[PDB]
Amino acid sequence: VQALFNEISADAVFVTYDGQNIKKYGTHLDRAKTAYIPASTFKIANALIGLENHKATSTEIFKWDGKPRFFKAWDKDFTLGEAMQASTVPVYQELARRIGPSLMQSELQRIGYGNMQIGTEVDQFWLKGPLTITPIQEVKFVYDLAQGQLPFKPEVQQQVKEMLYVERRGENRLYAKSGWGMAVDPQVGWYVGFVEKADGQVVAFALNMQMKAGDDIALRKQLSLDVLDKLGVFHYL
């Protein structure tokens, strides 16, 4: 499992949490206590805050305004859940603006998300700082989401869980969110989520790694699923 990790020159940590114990794997374990920008993984918290504070619904269609976005794949209409899986920044920036800086700040503090700092710009703080979060905090946040244990209404947590539903493999279910922060140095790669196993156990996970411009986009998920197979959490079908 260690051999898997250093087949790349990836500098990387993989964290698991089962509600009592944190386990760490990879090439650079100190990464798990290290704080990084959440990038696209912040969409989980943005969705939760938005639904809880009645700023959006899980059925609302955020329409494209016709102005070309950073990626052409984002030049369409999205619900929050579709935007979650496509990582559609401008949709979640619209949501963040509906929320507003003081409510966003008060809410991230209330729920104890990372360092709880947003600064002045309500649509940039998760992409360039000053908000940072450790992979351990990330694994515990999504674990709590999985259990309905976050400080949000139960139906809100359920809605955001379904936004993260990415694979069914028998009676096992995978929930995940990827992230690639490119506007910081060094670049940060995330793949965070949980597996709801057929036996009833949930295991939460977080991949956190250094990235750079060459890197293939699928590598984070591949790695994660690789490790989860090796650990026995989510076997390849």
Ligand SMILES: *C(=O)[C@@H]([C@@H]1NC(C(=O)O)=C(S[C@@H]2CN[C@H](C(=O)N(C)C)C2)[C@@H]1C)[C@@H](C)O
């Ligand atoms: C979030 O961290 C950023 C997005 N995160 C990801 C990602 O996790 O893969 C991407 S990749 C981007 C969106 N999908 C485009 C694509 O796959 N095609 C056009 C085929 C590439 C983003 C970098 C967000 C902050 O931008």
